[PDB]
Structure 1
Amino acid sequence: EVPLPQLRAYTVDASWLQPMAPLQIADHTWQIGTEDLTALLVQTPDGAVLLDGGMPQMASHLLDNMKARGVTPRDLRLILLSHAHADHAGPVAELKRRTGAKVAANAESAVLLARGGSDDLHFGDGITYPPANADRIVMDGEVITVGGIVFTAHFMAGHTPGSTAWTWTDTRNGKPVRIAYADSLSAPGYQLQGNPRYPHLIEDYRRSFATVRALPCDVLLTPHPGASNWDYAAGARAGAKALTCKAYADAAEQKFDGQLAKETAG
């Protein structure tokens, strides 16, 4: 006779969990996550901002890299998120407990975060993580300012209802650099058409392709660096092959159209 199956842990490619030292993107912006998961530190004269944290087991590594950059736990003021799945918001609860950081997110991301990713529209309870509360709810196009760096929220619903692109302007060589951190545009294993949990899913993805295409975007970064052709292990040429926001959106839409056609056939 047969017991119910054991719970299955959320396991990922080893490179997603491979720690790296801080990689500078612009004058105040650093990649401090792992080889294949983005976690951006923005350092200001008035505290630091973290955008995404990667997987749940990455908290101490993130804190180590912040320390290397001169950022103590007290100095981290704000956490922002691309979307509230386990491999990007994983360590948020722990980071809040261990730092001064407060979380700002839109309503959709906040409720999913507060559920620890449970009851996912597509994944069910398959990919959960420690829940956390948002300290501030943001609306589309709203700005948040830290130490004089201005972050703008651009909603791009689809991958999750609360998927967000964050944009800000840094400097490099005395010139402004408009950085766009665009969320995933993938739909891995999703039912796209006639999904009872997400009836306007296709319309939202189409709108989000257009949103991403139009972002202020000298430099594109994505939660999975491979999606924008970043190679965090490539040192001085880490960002050399990076896509434009236009190319990223076009590639995503072509892939999406292919998935729709396969779904109709399958």
Structure 2
Amino acid sequence: ASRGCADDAGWNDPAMPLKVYGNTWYVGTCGISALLVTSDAGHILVDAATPQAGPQILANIRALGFRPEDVRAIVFSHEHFDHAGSLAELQKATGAPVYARAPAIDTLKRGLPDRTDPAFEVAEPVAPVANIVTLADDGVVSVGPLALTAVASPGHTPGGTSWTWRSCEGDDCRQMVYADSLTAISDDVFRYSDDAAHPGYLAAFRNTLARVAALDCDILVTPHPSASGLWNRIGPRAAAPLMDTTACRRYAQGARQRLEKRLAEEAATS
């Protein structure tokens, strides 16, 4: 029997791919999520993991019997190297456009962020993405019968987005939420409390927390699977229900607590 994935798994440690629910499949690594949402008209790939992950994601898509060439749209959570790292590689393999909100586009074209990213100084360089479609902050990405709805989630980064859609097993349909990271982490310079350096940024983070908390959610997944306890819910170590309609609310509430802890840490230092 396979032993499954650890909660502190390396970002590049391989995961056997497996159904989340209905036509939503997990194709990421043990430490970093990626999802494939499938239809007989084509597929949507959600996230690209770490600049090293192109081949594992492609192998996992094929392991499930899907063709990368049948992917018609790529979306992602946020423009850090551990989630956007293999976007260019995946666009070449699929021929699919990458959808991105305005505040992520320059980062995707450069392959590095600028100082608007809290984690600017610890960024690793990425391959630029050649074909980007600018996504409105409440935009819908449609491929055949598939429809993924964007929820703009700035805070962890300027360009972060959460995604939501419905997947069905027969007549039993679930609202899936791939909620962006909500951790208030940074490099050694950035201060969330320095509004003059980034006006409105922290207010936008608080707004993101409230919006995520309010989403209709049946099944939550997060870019770092441990942030939503994914490996306690699917795979060999599963011991808790996959569906939990309180998950988004608890996720955002915990994130708010941690954000306020970060603000207390900033108040304590010069």
Q: TM-score, normalised by structure 2?
A: 0.87
Alignment partner of 1:158 is 2:161: no
Q: Which runs of 5+ in 2 are unaligned?
A: 1-7
Deviation of 1:70 (Å): 2.1
Q: Does 1:237 align with 2:232?
A: no
Question: For 1:172, which of 169, 174, 193 is the aligned residue?
Answer: 169
Letter matched to residue 50 of structure 1? L
2 CA distance for matches of 1:169 and 1:196? 41
Q: 1:73 to 1:112 in 2, by over 3 A?
A: same
SS at match of 1:74: helix
Question: How many angstroms does 1:123 deviate by?
Answer: 3.2
d(CA) in 2 for partners of 1:26, 1:88: 22
Amino acid at match of 2:212: V
Q: Which moved more, 1:191-200 or 1:86-95?
A: 191-200
Shift of 1:40: 0.4
Greater Cα offset, 93-102 or 219-228: 93-102
Per the alignment, in what secondary structure is the counterpart of residue 17 of structure 1?
A: coil
Q: Percent identity?
A: 37
Q: SS at 2:255's partner residue?
A: helix
Q: What CA distance in whole angstroms lies between the structure 2 residues aligned with 1:130 and 1:223?
A: 20
Deviation at 1:196, TM superposition (A): 4.8
- Alignment counterpart, residue 265 of structure 1, candidates 218, 243, 268: 268
Counterpart position of 1:256: 259
The letter for the 2-side match of 1:163 is G
Q: Could you tell me how far 1:23 is from its partner in structure 2?
A: 1.7
Look up the equivalent residue of 1:148 and give its one-letter code. Answer: P
Secondary structure in 1 aligned to 2:175?
A: strand
Q: 1:39 matched to which residue of 2?
A: 34
Deviations 1:21-56 (A, max 9, x none): 112111100111111100001111111111001001
Aligned to 1:135: 132
Report if the CA contact (8 A) 2:195-2:202 is conserved. Answer: no
* Residue number in structure 2 paired with 1:5: none
Structure 1, residues 162-194: CA drift from partner, whole Å, max 9, x if none?
110100000135211000111011121341111
Task: Give the structure 2 partner of residue 7 of structure 1.
Answer: none
1:147-226 paired onto structure 2 within 5 Å: 147-172=144-169, 174-189=171-186, 190-226=190-226
Which sits farther off after the overlay, 111-120 or 62-71?
Answer: 111-120
- Contact 1:140-1:155 at 8 Å conserved across structures: yes
Check if 1:57 corresponds to 2:52.
Answer: yes
Structure having greater relative contact order (Cα 8 Å, sep ≥ 6):
2
Alignment of 1:114-129 (within 5 A): 114-121=109-116, 122-124=118-120, 126-127=122-123, 128-129=125-126
CA RMSD of aligned residues (A): 2.0
Alpha carbons of structure 1 residues 14 and 120: separation in structure 2 relative to 1, 3 Å: farther
Shift of 1:234: 4.0
2:236 counterpart letter in structure 1: G
- Of stretches 114-123 and 42-51 in structure 1, the one that deviates more from structure 2 is 114-123
Match of 1:20 in 2: 15
Pair 1:234–1:99, CA change in 2 (3 A): closer
Alpha-carbon distance in structure 2 between the residues aligned to 1:134 and 1:214: 33
Q: Which runs of 5+ in 1 are unaligned?
A: 1-12
Equivalent residue, structure 1, for 2:5: none
Between stretches 239-248 and 67-76, larger displacement belongs to 239-248
Task: Indicate how the Cα distance of structure 1 residues 143 and 118 shifts in structure 2: closer, same or farther if over 3 A, else same.
Answer: closer
CA contact (8 A) 1:83 1:162 kept: yes
CA distance in 1, matches of 2:194, 2:259: 15
- Deviation for aligned residue 1:139: 0.8
Q: TM-score, normalised by structure 1?
A: 0.89
